[PDB]
Structure 1
């Protein structure tokens, strides 16, 4: 149908059809008389999978032959989403499969909807790892993603009575056609035990053993025939395990629970033992795998020249002490040599400045679970502080501040400090974030080793986030500048010469309207809800957090509602406000915010006077597959976190690439997005980081705003009086109390500027032509936000490897 989807050659379609029928018969053991859509989905998945094998096998032996420097990306999360369409796109098989299935009397689009999302992540951090894998394969890097194969990913969210209900994400129920178990490469992981000091070195003995079984998933690059590997570990109990008899076998579940479920707290620190076990589990198995591959290609001096280990936040921070343990205790290298190798091998990426997200493990936990590692950490700390003392003689408080060991109620190990000390590079994920790291949180470390600190602004893959989810937009773009931009997003800048092209302006607007119609239909089909396709689609989708300020959005919605009720017959630009996102199961306030959103909808959506001028919808179960549907349909992207709290953000980049204008604060990557597109083409409002600091020095008093802004006062009084909860008048008391007395994120402080900025958005929207021209200016300058640019920078500035665009043989 469309160009960018590849060719549908006669011999290709014929081949696909026969292989489809072959899998349906021999693999699924069914025939078209009893086959259901799910059977058809699997037949298609196995057919497409077959086309990956040849490339996967030769890519890997290619690396074995050339022995390039290998990149290991360690992460506890990989938010992959669906794999079928992405694979077809990268292999240029989409139109051929579309034709083949069509000829078989099947709609490929409905078969794709059957696949379960691989939701092995919470949100931004997990999705970043996924985009990174796609870009590393596309850039021809010998990269490996290493993580945990969770039996249960992020929970599925259901809304009952306006409240969030959680249910297990049993994503492996029907099987996973994309993975390949490699039980033959199973490795042992040790826990507990004690340390023995012999004549020659320490020994970790009397340990409990848990096996790590790897499962490999292919990661195809964009049409370059490169297929890398994502290896995820699954926990298995040994067979001598617990060896009355029956109970011993049932207790095997104790050890296998390590890979059972993903913690769903959007990575806010919860010092639970199971979480620590997961972190060591991935680190221990991965490192053995890395060393094995290194020895099978003993001077470890060349180790850093053949290996790069990237720590995705501090979750895999134990890789530092574990690498030291292996080199010193097992390989017998002297400490200083082992440390040199470790530092040159490891690099650390920080993803947030929020204090409650930083990992600070109780010493007593490490002491019991990983005795040897605690000893190694103490030694690292001693030697590190000796260096600090030599550089800043007499500065005793600096020694206390920089220590890896934190004193107080209970001793804790600051994992961020451990990562900085043991890595040759430390980076933030957006310019403003990286600067904040050097000015505040890690100031002392920056002063000691300035050369270690870098910035690597985040990005998103244009394959999944443009070509896959918005073929219509990708097509009209390709018609003008070709298809080269798909792997070189900077070429989108060529579109600036079309900002005055009436034809292009019309097509851009047409694509958006089509996406909105498609989404409006979806809302009614799988969830039943009417929405005016001719209204402005105001969208805020991301995890529910106080720092992301969904509450500020709520205040604006209520303001719009009160103004309409005030002057019913006055004209206002119609809007359908959509808010979606999951709340951590034990985050009370986050759950109350979801309830408030639905409560507002209950009132607004049923007010006769409002009509179809304002609708408020809470998008249930926000996840990667849903993002692929709602983002292309958005007109306005809400990125309104308090300045200085959102390290980068990536959803913001997805909206920019898909034709939505952005209303937001100068926070995270928003700053760079506005710089690229031009401030006049962005809806910027609110306090800047400097303003937030001034307010804190003075002392934030929410009452001041309440007393000076009549419209704000009215909203609070409505919330407090039970206007949005007639049966439970004081239902939102906690929310009001927080806003009025302990709001760490200053919602009221940005209210006035936010509402005014929103008025300007509405003004531009009623002038279709100028709205679309601004959209074109945004799409045209979104090139910097391709994860291909991000990965190329990591490769050249941190890993020491040159990216390649050269395609491999088939």
Structure 2
């Protein structure tokens, strides 16, 4: 078997008795009534047993050495399953595979029983998860802090072609990886009012909610380091949530506890979109307030807070945890009694902010009346921060009255709002973009004024993905043939993949690379019929676009091409065309009407295309249901063509693009986000780039975008629009897609028509290359061998050195 570790004689034996120990004592089951679910749990408990020894010493180690601690605050942690990942980082995979084999069980069958920890929406949440893995592997004293939602991202079901949402009760059967720590429970306050006394302000008459932490281990890759991800759960106090007497009902008071506990009930399913609901604000303060208390308590142990920034670094994943800034000030000034200026100095020095997008509708602008009611003291502090900051601007740009209102944290208008992004820039010593182009756009556009004020704050840290889950875990076959030639060191040193460049002409390697891709496609084609049922051809080109559904991601542009391919086949049926299976998957936010309309369009196209006899097996349109982390681990290794076609300047970075590049897929995309650095790394000749560049989009906006022009000059495009309009794809409901056509023609913010011509032309070129297996594979090798820059180990090493002030280390911790 592969390099999933050694199957030692002693350890396979030990593993088996421990599996049986847990099956008996833990699951209280006996082999005659044990269900596959029981088997999965016995295995999970057995594997978890192997890292507790290390978990304890790692934490005890940090207490003894007392290094600078890194706190990664995020309202999202898209973790996925954790059994296999743990086996991989502990080098237990083969041993476990062997032991379960002898016990007569299929480890892979058991792995499929674990529920995904879908505590994230998409890119932002998955980045946090990849980062945690990298920080452990690089031996950093890092803690992931978030909310323990009992309901993560909804499960997507397709009914009559429409998306149906259903509760993700991932904790239903229990979570063997987490452990409640009811000793560090903390109180969080809400509402109340502010009393200004003789020696300071006081936040009074507040409603209290308790925060209970749950620890989940985050093991580094084979270095015996296990860090901690601490997730907070909301709990109602038993007193006032019953003790505020004088009629109401005792039963009711108890039932009403599910009001304070609703705070950690569900994750908001919005990807790159802001909804100013009070429940959202409560979750944001809740995670911030509890986390900070825990951070300061740890520090008080390790009162001159002058050294605080030397021992603490808190990274803000977007503006979601932005209240950490005014909350840190509140504690320092109100409770610790530090002078404003000393407090501010400390705050700015420990906080750093990461921007994830430039679309306005994703920007957090919280109405003042909301902050006024829920967090009165924080509003006062934000006003004071704004006051002193604007004074700084005025001093720097005397008389520039418009710049003052442009930079204010407070926005005037219909209703006053607080620009959380401006808050973060002012109270952070570092602000970074997630890709070189996005980082430049921030300085030239969105945060230009801030950049002019303090240029030193703005940096870039191109995103990355973990090669452990995204290669070794999901594509062992590819990881193995690579290791056969260059060794195993690249798993924690992805740059070494370049060494594969010297095998680009190796006949055996070319054959191998092509073989694992073919095995991956056969396995996925099988899984498709197994769990979803309705056949696909594994010899065709696997064209896949998987990511959340968004107008800016342009799944619609993908559809136009699919319809074009179909129309061409119907025009010349007996002409040869490279067979394709185009797969589009992704979830739409429940309130995003357009995004839900696009899913129906995709399934509607498949209904026509998939049953046309003249088309045969040359073209299949499949919608990948419930796209999530665990599903990504299956499709990506099986893809040939990765679609990254967002309008230039809208996708901050993207990460799925990197996952595809590492797994042997070629990329067709625009010069957007990280696509630019990937093409730059692999060489543009090895990439399928097309469409407008940022500049072209801007030129078009100056003169004005008119979709009619494109409709008028392109007969193929016109034909498609008239097919949608006449009900060709919706016979029973001829006007079903009027909203889509209307939008494309009159309010297309992402100019889908503008990139149509260059897109289908470019798609022609990928089909030409696919016809030449040998050359396709050689280009694949150029992409894989050149993907090393996109490992989150590189990203983290840069954050560590350029933002946190800590030195990464690949030193093995002193055994378990």
TM-score (norm 2): 0.99
The residue number in structure 2 matching 1:49 is 48
Who is 1:494 aligned against? 499
How well do the aligned residues superpose, as a CA RMSD in angstroms? 0.4
1: distance between equivalents of 2:701 and 2:271? 26
Q: Using the alignment, how far apart are the partners of 1:555 and 1:386 within structure 2?
A: 52
Deviations 1:639-683 (A, max 9, x none): 000000000000000000000000000000000000000000000
Q: Is the contact made by 1:74 and 1:310 (CA closer than 8 Å) also made in structure 2?
A: yes
Contact residue 241 and residue 252 of structure 1 kept, 8 A: no
Give 1:265 shift: 1.0
Cα drift, residue 267 of structure 1:
4.0
**Could you report, residue by residue, the CA deviation over 1:66-113 in whole angstroms, capped at 9, with x for unpaired residues?**
000000000000000000000000000000000000000000000000
- Separation in structure 1 between the aligned mates of residue 230 and residue 120 of structure 2, nearest angstrom: 15
Paired with 1:420 and 1:124, the residues of 2 have a C-alpha distance of 22
Would the aligned equivalents of 1:144 and 1:230 in 2 still touch at CA under 8 Å?
A: yes
Contact 2:143-2:228 within 8 A present in 1 as well: yes
Are the equivalent residues in 1 in contact too, given 2:637–2:663 (CA < 8 A)?
Answer: yes
Asked if 2 retains the 8 angstrom alpha-carbon contact of 1:241 and 1:248, the reply is no
Equivalent-residue separation in structure 2 for 1:352 and 1:557 (angstroms): 29
**3-state SS of paired residue (1:253):** coil
8 Å Cα contact 1:79/1:119 also seen in 2: yes
CA contact (8 A) 2:436 2:460 kept: yes
Is contact 1:638-1:664 (8 Å) kept?
yes
Please give the secondary structure, in 2, of the residue aligned with 1:615: strand
SS at match of 1:164: strand
Distance in 2 between the 1:220 and 1:444 partners?
42
Judge conservation of contact 1:631–1:654 (CA < 8 Å) in 2: yes
Equivalents in 2 of 1:419, 1:666: separation in Å?
A: 29
- Residue-by-residue CA offset, 1:33-53 (whole Å, 9 max, x unaligned): 000100000000000000010
Separation in 1, partners of 2:227, 2:534: 42
How far does residue 242 in structure 1 lie from its aligned partner after superposition?
Answer: 3.0
Q: Is the 8 A contact 1:89 1:468 kept in 2?
A: yes
Give me the whole-angstrom Cα distance separating, in 2, the residues matched to 1:183 and 1:546: 44
In the TM superposition, what is the alpha-carbon distance from 1:241 to its structure 2 partner?
3.1
- Greater alpha carbon shift after TM alignment, 258-267 vs 126-135: 258-267
Distance 2:116 2:359 in 1: 29
Give how far 1:471 is off: 0.2
* Count of aligned residue pairs for this structure pair: 809
Deviations 1:602-661 (A, max 9, x none): 000000000000000000000000000000000000000000000000000000000000
Aligned pair 1:650/2:655, yes or no? Answer: yes
CA–CA distance in 2 between the matches of 1:183 and 1:473?
Answer: 44
Can you give the 5+ residue segments of structure 2 that lack an aligned partner in the other structure? Answer: 243-248
SS in 1 for 2:241: coil
Once the two structures are TM-superposed, the CA of residue 4 in structure 1 deviates from its matched residue by 2.0
Shift of 1:117: 0.1
CA shift, 1:376, in A, is: 0.2
C-alpha contact (below 8 Å) 1:429/1:648 kept by paired residues: yes
How far is 1:227 from its partner?
Answer: 0.1
Aligned partners of 1:75 and 1:129 also within 8 Å = yes
Q: Following the alignment from structure 1 to structure 2, what is the Cα–Cα distance between the partners of residues 682 and 519?
A: 25
2: distance between equivalents of 1:602 and 1:65? 63
- Secondary structure of the corresponding residue to residue 183 of structure 2: helix
Q: How far apart in 1 are the matches of 2:414 and 2:350?
A: 35
Deviations 1:218-268, CA, capped at 9 Å, x for gaps:
000000000000000000000103321000000000000000000001141
| Residues 75 and 316, structure 1, Cα contact 8 Å, conserved in 2 | yes
* Alpha-carbon distance in structure 2 between the residues aligned to 1:468 and 1:804: 23
Instruction: Measure the CA separation in 2 of the matches of 1:454 and 1:622.
Output: 33
Cα separation, 1, equivalents of 2:534 and 2:341: 65
Structure 1 counterpart SS, 2:613: coil
**Structure-1 residue corresponding to 2:791:** 786
Where 1:314 maps in the other structure, the secondary structure is coil
**1 CA distance for matches of 2:720 and 2:284?**
45
- Secondary structure of 1:151's aligned partner: coil
User: In 1, Cα distance between the equivalents of 2:757 and 2:173?
Assistant: 51
CA distance in 2, matches of 1:137, 1:454: 24
Structure 1 residue 572: deviation in Å? 0.1
Q: Deviations over 1:150-174 (max 9, x none)?
A: 0000000000000000000000000
Cα offsets for 1:194-234 (capped at 9, x unmatched) = 00000000000000000000000000000000000000000
CA separation in 2, counterparts of 1:362 and 1:4?
Answer: 55
Asked if the contact 1:59/1:228 (under 8 Å) is kept, the reply is yes
Q: Separation in 1 of the partners of 2:112 and 2:90? A: 20
- 1:401 corresponds, among 401, 406, 412, to 406
C-alpha contact 2:272 2:361 (8 A) present in aligned 1: no
Inter-partner Cα distance in structure 1 for 2:164 and 2:240: 37
Residues 666, 684 of structure 1: 8 Å contact kept: yes
Pairwise CA distance, 1:3: 3.4
For residues 500 and 285 of structure 1, what CA distance do their matches in structure 2 show?
56
Is the Cα contact below 8 Å between 1:218 and 1:229 reproduced in 2?
A: yes
Q: What's the counterpart of residue 344 of structure 2? A: 339
Q: Secondary structure at the match of 1:99?
A: helix
Following the alignment from structure 2 to structure 1, what is the Cα–Cα distance between the partners of residues 124 and 4?
29
- What SS does structure 2 have at the residue aligned with 1:617? strand
* 1:706 counterpart (695, 703, 711): 711
1:317 and 1:419 in contact (8 A); partners too: yes
Report Cα offsets for 1:411-451 as digits up to 9, x if no partner: 00000000000000000000000000000000000000000
For each residue in 1:9-58, what CA deviation from the matched residue of structure 2 results, as whole angstroms up to 9, or x when unmatched?
A: 00000000000000000000000000010000000000000001000000
Counterpart-to-counterpart distance in 2, 1:588 and 1:373: 35
CA distance in 2 between counterparts of 1:237 and 1:603 reads: 54
Residue 532 of structure 1 is matched in structure 2 by 537
Do the aligned residues in 1 keep the contact of 2:314 with 2:350 (CA within 8 Å)? yes
CA distance in 1, matches of 2:727, 2:182: 59
| 1:730 matches 2:729 | no
Deviation of 1:464 (Å)? 0.1
SS where residue 641 of structure 1 aligns?
coil
> Which residue of the partner structure matches residue 763 of structure 1?
768
Query: Can you list the C-alpha shifts for 1:351-389, whole angstroms capped at 9, x where unaligned?
Result: 000000000000000000000000000000000000000
CA distance in 2, matches of 1:438, 1:120: 32
SS at match of 1:3: coil
Q: Distance in 1 between matches of 2:193 and 2:604?
A: 55
Who is 1:151 aligned against?
150
- 1:105-129, Cα deviation, whole Å (9 max, x unpaired): 0000000000000000000000000
Spell out structure 1 runs of 4+ moving beyond 6 A: none
1:529 is displaced (CA, Å) by 1.8
Mapped to 1, the partners of 2:439 and 2:184 lie a distance apart of: 39
Task: Give how far 1:691 is off.
Answer: 0.1
Does the Cα contact within 8 Å between 1:122 and 1:267 map onto a contact in 2? no
1:302-341 deviations in Å (ceiling 9; x for gaps): 0000000000000000000000000000000000000000
CA positional deviation for 1:519? 0.1
**SS, match of residue 170 in structure 1:** coil
Question: What is the rounded CA distance, in whole Å, between the counterparts of 1:425 and 1:576 in structure 2?
Answer: 45
SS of alignment partner, residue 617 of structure 2: coil
Q: Per-residue displacement from partner, 1:288-312 (whole Å, max 9, x unpaired)?
A: 0000000011000000000000000
Note if contact 2:272-2:357 (Cα within 8 Å) is conserved in structure 1. Answer: no
- Structure 2 distance, partners of 1:3, 1:541, is 29
Q: Secondary structure at the match of 1:146?
A: strand
Q: TM-score, normalization: structure 1?
A: 1.00
Residues 77 and 126, structure 1, Cα contact 8 Å, conserved in 2 = yes
Give deviations 1:743-774, integer Å, cap 9, x for gaps. 00000000000000000000000000000000
Per the alignment, residue 573 of structure 2 pairs with 568
Q: Which runs of 5+ in 1 are unaligned?
A: none
Q: Report SS of the residue matched to 1:278.
A: helix
| Residue equivalent to 1:808 | 813
1:175 and 1:185 map into 2 onto residues whose CA distance is 22
In the alignment, is residue 322 of structure 1 matched against residue 332 of structure 2?
A: no
Q: Are 1:41 and 1:111, in contact at CA under 8 Å, matched by a contact in 2?
A: yes
Contact conserved, 1:706 with 1:712, CA < 8 A, in 2? Answer: yes
Tell me if the contact between 2:156 and 2:165 (Cα under 8 Å) persists in the aligned partners.
yes
Which is worse superposed, 670-679 or 233-242?
A: 233-242
Give 3-state SS (helix, strand or coil) of 1:609's partner.
Answer: coil
